[PDB]
Design an enzyme around this catalytic site. Structure first.
Site, PDB file in Angstrom:
ATOM      1  N   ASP D  97      26.992  13.218  16.338  1.00 35.58           N
ATOM      2  CA  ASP D  97      26.348  12.199  17.179  1.00 35.58           C
ATOM      3  C   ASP D  97      27.057  12.032  18.530  1.00 35.58           C
ATOM      4  O   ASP D  97      26.475  11.547  19.510  1.00 35.58           O
ATOM      5  CB  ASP D  97      26.307  10.837  16.464  1.00 35.58           C
ATOM      6  N   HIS D 139      28.894   0.622  19.984  1.00 37.28           N
ATOM      7  CA  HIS D 139      29.261   1.266  18.706  1.00 37.28           C
ATOM      8  C   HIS D 139      30.684   1.842  18.658  1.00 37.28           C
ATOM      9  O   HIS D 139      31.177   2.171  17.586  1.00 37.28           O
ATOM     10  CB  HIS D 139      28.254   2.373  18.369  1.00 37.28           C
ATOM     11  N   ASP D 175      20.291  -5.421  21.056  1.00 37.96           N
ATOM     12  CA  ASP D 175      19.934  -4.039  20.745  1.00 37.96           C
ATOM     13  C   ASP D 175      19.236  -3.947  19.378  1.00 37.96           C
ATOM     14  O   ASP D 175      19.484  -4.760  18.498  1.00 37.96           O
ATOM     15  CB  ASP D 175      21.196  -3.172  20.770  1.00 37.96           C
ATOM     16  N   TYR D 309      15.385   4.826  24.527  1.00 39.16           N
ATOM     17  CA  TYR D 309      15.243   6.271  24.557  1.00 39.16           C
ATOM     18  C   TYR D 309      13.882   6.713  25.103  1.00 39.16           C
ATOM     19  O   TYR D 309      13.592   7.900  25.195  1.00 39.16           O
ATOM     20  CB  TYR D 309      15.507   6.809  23.167  1.00 39.16           C
TER      21      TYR D 309
HETATM   22  O1  LIG Z   1      20.925   3.083  20.512  1.00 39.41           O
HETATM   23  C1  LIG Z   1      21.717   3.183  19.633  1.00 39.41           C
HETATM   24  N1  LIG Z   1      22.706   2.154  19.366  1.00 39.41           N
HETATM   25  O2  LIG Z   1      22.808   0.973  20.111  1.00 39.41           O
HETATM   26  C2  LIG Z   1      21.774   4.398  18.712  1.00 39.41           C
HETATM   27  C3  LIG Z   1      20.844   5.390  18.457  1.00 39.41           C
HETATM   28  C4  LIG Z   1      21.262   6.369  17.512  1.00 39.41           C
HETATM   29  C5  LIG Z   1      20.479   7.473  17.093  1.00 39.41           C
HETATM   30 CL1  LIG Z   1      18.844   7.709  17.776  1.00 39.41          CL
HETATM   31  C6  LIG Z   1      20.989   8.368  16.166  1.00 39.41           C
HETATM   32  C7  LIG Z   1      22.267   8.186  15.636  1.00 39.41           C
HETATM   33  C8  LIG Z   1      23.038   7.099  16.045  1.00 39.41           C
HETATM   34  C9  LIG Z   1      22.522   6.203  16.985  1.00 39.41           C
HETATM   35  S1  LIG Z   1      23.147   4.764  17.729  1.00 39.41           S
HETATM   36  K   LIG Z   2      21.799  -5.902  18.069  1.00 41.06           K
HETATM   37 ZN   LIG Z   3      20.333   0.818  19.698  1.00 39.91          ZN
END
Ligand SMILES: O=C(NO)c1cc2c(Cl)cccc2s1
Ligand SMILES: [K+]
Ligand SMILES: [Zn+2]
Ligand SMILES: O=C(NO)c1cc2c(Cl)cccc2s1
Ligand SMILES: O=C(NO)c1cc2c(Cl)cccc2s1
Ligand SMILES: O=C(NO)c1cc2c(Cl)cccc2s1
Ligand SMILES: O=C(NO)c1cc2c(Cl)cccc2s1
Ligand SMILES: O=C(NO)c1cc2c(Cl)cccc2s1
Ligand SMILES: O=C(NO)c1cc2c(Cl)cccc2s1
Ligand SMILES: O=C(NO)c1cc2c(Cl)cccc2s1
Ligand SMILES: [K+]
Ligand SMILES: [K+]
Ligand SMILES: [K+]
Ligand SMILES: [K+]
Ligand SMILES: [K+]
Ligand SMILES: [K+]
Ligand SMILES: [K+]
Ligand SMILES: [Zn+2]
Ligand SMILES: [Zn+2]
Ligand SMILES: [Zn+2]
Lengths: 408, 397, 399, 408
Positions: D97, D139, D175, D309
């Site tokens: 990731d 994260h 989020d 996204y």
């Molecule tokens: O937008 C995100 N976190 O705030 C995340 C998206 C993803 C995806 Cl699409 C795949 C794996 C981990 C994450 S964290």
């Molecule tokens: K959140």
């Molecule tokens: Zn997110």
């Protein structure tokens, strides 16, 4: 002698439709590539001495007005007024069955092929004749249906049955109900029709299912058999479902000729994806099982194509059917290589290039249908003063412990 | 050309219901008896290549469990009594009381869908300028509920196909009853404007399409102002009905400028319908219906015409026969001369006692609604950034 | 590279069941105590972008209605007793008796799937040559049924992803005391996944399959005929006899099948000290552990390999065995010699390894010939059916 | 003064990642296209006077060994890894990731530079609100990259805020995902109250922020970490109804000196996640409602980006958020055209080219979560010896007739 309908022009015409493209070419060339052609007697398609004799042949079933319209439809696309549109619509020459530059020629060709096949049987030149360019079971007297414009099967049957107590058994193995052939002979006891197929709400064409079952009328009562099956059915269950019924039909009716429509859209790999039949030959192809059973009767037989929209897999099936017919009739072993042979359509058999369709079989009874169909057969026999050999039919179903299903 | 949906199987299935019996056969035979069939392009009902494809088509609007239930209901009525658990299943979908099961209830219901989807397809591929389906028009059916002897909503599915082929659709519901199923389906959708004219009064089926100081609900989300309703009191005649909806139809066309028009033409507004609520006629010297259909056909927008209610079967047939002739006239520009006397045919005896084509009948709040409907339309137009000659729209009133 | 599946949440979930308690924590901590973790690449459990993608992944094998029932069962156990109707529902998926519900039954079951799918992916993208998941290996679960403490079949799903990459062929080797019936059944009709289970079998012993069924052995159907292999053994078998029983079969399967991947279920319930007390295998590394013998043999093939856990109810002794399997994998893959002290090092779980605190488990240590000829004939038949080239006596020589 | 973080180099770096492409440029250019930039005080990203000072700033949260690794990873992609460099990267989840790429450290650092400068503008009272659409990477852990977060700009920003001079920071995470990295960083700290609303379900990343009872901090931090996990499918109004009263209650009781809001746009109906159904509609968008509410408190506020996204729709939402902040803080009406203005990214807003996202909105309650959350807030207030204004909280919930949910 095993005959097969083929010709250079015939091939060009059978390959000129927008829906079925070059499928017939794939079939014949795969049969050719497996060196089956030298085993077979070529049966040339029928030609006539004038337009009037052609017209007379075709209108033995179809209406004069329908044939004229189909002619005009061809002519039109070879170069439409408000009334041209309405005329074609009144014959369903639209939507599923539109015009294209060779629509009449294309349609006539299947009739030429199947009438010739029928003639080859009648004069006893061939014990069996195959026409993979024919088998258009949906065409009606004055209407095109399901890509079928002229009903070659009705016309071939009419030729057989009117040759010379002569009965014809029609066996329709296509995924779809053979409504056009059943309808043509609805009032005729001497052509017994039998279609096994999928049927469900909204599924083309809608018939061959509950209404009880209608099964013919007038002198034709009890002469139209139907076995609608649910989706997902495999080779063994489809085989068990229709095998005893075919033998019983042969025992009671004692046909002088059998006509088999062998539409390949029951294959697991067909775009329809409704049945899960295969072309496997050791777990045995439902198709090859039925064909071998029919051929074991030693009754002169016409084997016709039909549906099948996975062209390479259709070729794979019909090539094995052809090899099997040669075996069963000539008593001559036909060993077929598991790898597709070199020829100009070799690239269409990818990515495996193997004769078995690329499917992995894996895994609801219809005993009341058997009981119903045997009672209809009993009634047919009584109405037509035929012997109903309860002994032999019982013994038949008893081979599976189902003798109880047989009426006295 | 002008299309019309029929077929042999289609006729048998449309005549298989307990409530509507052989009505469809009277209608088509009368159309045939008056020689209109040669003027018309036969449109065959849609059929599908597999059970999955059929389910895909129908569950574009209806829930899968509802469709499963409806299909189970058919099988049950082809073998039997239902168990307690089945009764419970059926009740949760209202497959009961007004909408009971019968031996061919799923096939019967699906047929109307097959018919109106082909009708839509014929319009989309531009094979026909107008398609008629007198076997369709079941406007009460909901996503997961049978209602008003409607089991599947062929109109919602036809309209969905039309908007999915920037497309705007105008739905015009002339049935005596509010077209709630269709209105609900596009409640959130501005691309499909619905307009129902109907009777409404306390306890009258189905209860909606009127004041809900109460106000008119009219859509939600981006579909706000996109559902139009004109409830009318009992006793209204041709002229008053025509004047009531005339300016509205014309204003809707001007502002919406639809790519397709779908008309539900339920005949239960006839003075001779056993409901006995409105007093419309099938008169052609003028019939409310004939007035409305002609106004809509004058727009020269590709148009689907559907049936619906109508419980006096010969008078329904007398009405839809005139509608079918009128369409042939307005689209093809070809004069249709219908004899005043019913021609001999299979069902000639049903047309007693006089055997005439005319039905056997002798013949301020609306202004409030007009002002309200006009402000809703402007509001709709505003919210959707449309071009509106308000200098034109108002003069229609 | 050698991967191993772990994570803080993963650990918490794998330790949430009443049946296996903190076994996974004991395993990973022993491995950590012996300083193996810096030698391994962490493979994190797979997670999904949405409920829909999770369901799609899981229902590649399991029915939707079963996954629904399993998720309902977890929610029901999170609140205060089930209704009669829910009880019936759960019974129809065998979510009862051996496989009851508990507050995190779906998360727990799903975690093992997450880990073994991440393991499969690490192989396919070739980030790791071998990957270990001691949280996985639940071989009894079926499409719509829980069985033998198995709720979701992580192995079937891992294998499906392996064969669904890119003719990819997978060899599944099940070393558990019990017959790997769920995996075998899932690939009953597939020639591309050859399953082979060695196990105890006898009347009344779970799950009852993987043996004679004049009966004879079923071994696949359709195009999957002869593709399921089974070697059932009598109780009391020791390291050496087990090794010799399995050795020649493993070698010839590899020769003939030439797999692209090997998935190994390494259930530790064959240990002499498992409370089952059926087989008498050890974790000895000089006789020599049947387990280590088999793993070394499979690793010697140089095929990307997935190693999973499974049964094993003597938790410290399961920890002892899998700690040694892990070290062996590191040695065999990286060429780097691993020196493990014979005494348990200090760590948080050290007390559990009494009374002697040694790495060795506390233990003082014809029919198979017919099975070998039978299995050899099946392998011949499989190759025949599947157009595989091989020798004949080169295969036979190993015996 | 409403500040916004931007610069030329900053733009290039924020746009240098494989995962997020040119999203940041679309956002800033749409904001520019609607002529909002003249209303905003450019806040330049923080730069340092030496590597050691940079290192000191980042390791205020992250381990030396993780930052070393992340530095090396950048160097490597700027030149194959050895087996041990691979193991080194794997130990920090610098894989899968969060893979390496040529600018991975510069990219990650930039967000830190933006959010630290933003925090500094608030501290010295140059801005009452600062926006950083390049930040919000919630994260990232102490020694671990996660969910394409490598460095945790939010933790670093909050830390700068909370160290400036009874000073409490409220962190609000809007989020789609649980803000686990921020929550975990301040798990033992009462002066940073974290609140995350998100989707949570079996298998959904990152797995936390849901039932384990709820964990909510430890030691002095007990009761200081708030979570509201929501089921799939929620619309603007329900989401609004869900967090509105919780936000107002958090403000009443905790009395923050600063609010930091992560405004990840992946709750949008048009996000490829397709889990929530929020919009950017404004006559109402959940986001806009929440931001408007938070701004009404008149507390110095940091607004950050995050997930999202569907890049044009993220720009569409954050542009609206930006105009709203100007409106709310300056008192200056910001009329925004429904048509996307001409600019070099105009073609990315097809086929409609309008500012509203292309979406048609069309028992499930969480009142027990409110009760739970308010109980936790009471527990927090008591632990930290703060006034729990029962009546004000009661009157707040009583607007919706739910005052009974409030504990004394
Ligand atoms: O937008 C995100 N976190 O705030 C995340 C998206 C993803 C995806 Cl699409 C795949 C794996 C981990 C994450 S964290
Ligand atoms: K959140
Ligand atoms: Zn997110
Ligand atoms: O194969 C057929 N009949 O024997 C038919 C196929 C189709 C398809 Cl694919 C669509 C519509 C009608 C028919 S009839
Ligand atoms: O007697 C025969 N060959 O020597 C055969 C005749 C037939 C017929 Cl007429 C039909 C089907 C198969 C065979 S084999
Ligand atoms: O025609 C109708 N709707 O368009 C309906 C008539 C009735 C009656 Cl007569 C009773 C109950 C429901 C309905 S819907
Ligand atoms: O152009 C026409 N006739 O020459 C007409 C077209 C239409 C359409 Cl598209 C709908 C309804 C009526 C008419 S007449
Ligand atoms: O380890 C096992 N399978 O691989 C199993 C153990 C048990 C027990 Cl102890 C009782 C019932 C079923 C199973 S499966
Ligand atoms: O090629 C290798 N090292 O350079 C190795 C590959 C493998 C595989 Cl694929 C499995 C087990 C051990 C090794 S060593
Ligand atoms: O007083 C003000 N404008 O005249 C405002 C101050 C703030 C703060 Cl400090 C934060 C968020 C919004 C506003 S409006
Ligand atoms: K058939
Ligand atoms: K017949
Ligand atoms: K109406
Ligand atoms: K609407
Ligand atoms: K085993
Ligand atoms: K297998
Ligand atoms: K905290
Ligand atoms: Zn067919
Ligand atoms: Zn009505
Ligand atoms: Zn076991």
């Amino acid at each position: 002698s095993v005959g097969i309908v083929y010709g250079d022009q015939y091939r060009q015409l059978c390959c000129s439709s927008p829906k079925f493209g070059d499928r017939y070419a794939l079939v014949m060339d795969l049969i050719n590539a497996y060196k089956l052609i030298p085993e077979l007697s070529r049966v040339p398609p029928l030609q006539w001495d004038s337009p009037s004799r052609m017209y007379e042949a075709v209108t033995a079933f179809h209406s004069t007005e329908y044939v004229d319209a189909l002619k005009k439809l061809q002519m039109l696309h070879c170069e439409l007024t408000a009334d041209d549109e309405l005329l074609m619509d009144s014959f369903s020459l639209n939507y599923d069955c539109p015009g294209f530059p060779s629509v009449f020629d294309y349609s006539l060709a299947a009739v030429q092929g199947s009438l010739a096949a029928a003639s080859a049987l009648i004069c006893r030149h061939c014990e069996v004749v195959i026409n993979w360019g024919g088998g258009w079971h949906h065409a009606k007297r004055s209407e095109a249906s399901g890509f079928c414009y002229l009903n070659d099967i009705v016309l071939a049957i009419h030729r057989l049955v009117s040759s010379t107590q002569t009965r014809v058994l029609y066996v329709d193995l296509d995924l779809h109900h053979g409504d056009g052939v059943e309808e043509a002979f609805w009032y005729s006891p001497r052509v017994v029709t039998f279609s096994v197929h999928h049927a469900s709400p909204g599924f083309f064409p809608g018939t061959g299912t509950w209404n009880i079952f209608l099964n013919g009328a007038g002198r034709g009562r009890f002469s139209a058999f139907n076995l609608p099956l649910e989706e997902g059915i495999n080779d063994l269950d489809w085989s068990n479902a229709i095998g005893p019924i075919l033998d019983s039909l042969n025992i009671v009716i004692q046909p002088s000729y059998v006509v088999v429509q062998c539409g390949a859209d029951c294959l697991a790999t067909d775009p329809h994806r409704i049945f899960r039949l295969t072309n496997f030959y050791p777990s045995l192809s439902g198709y090859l099982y039925a064909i071998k059973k029919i051929l074991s009767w030693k009754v002169p037989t016409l084997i016709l194509g039909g549906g099948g929209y996975n062209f390479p897999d259709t070729a794979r099936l019909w090539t094995r059917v052809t090899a099997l017919t040669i075996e069963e009739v000539k008593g001559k072993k036909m060993t077929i290589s598991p790898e597709i042979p070199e020829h100009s359509y070799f690239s269409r058999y990818g990515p495996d290039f193997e004769l078995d369709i690329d499917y992995f079989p894996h895994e609801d009874s219809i005993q009341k249908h058997h009981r119903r169909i045997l009672e209809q057969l009993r009634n047919y026999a009584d109405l037509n003063k035929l012997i109903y050999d309860y002994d032999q039919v019982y013994q038949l179903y008893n081979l599976t412990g189902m003798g109880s299903l047989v009426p006295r």
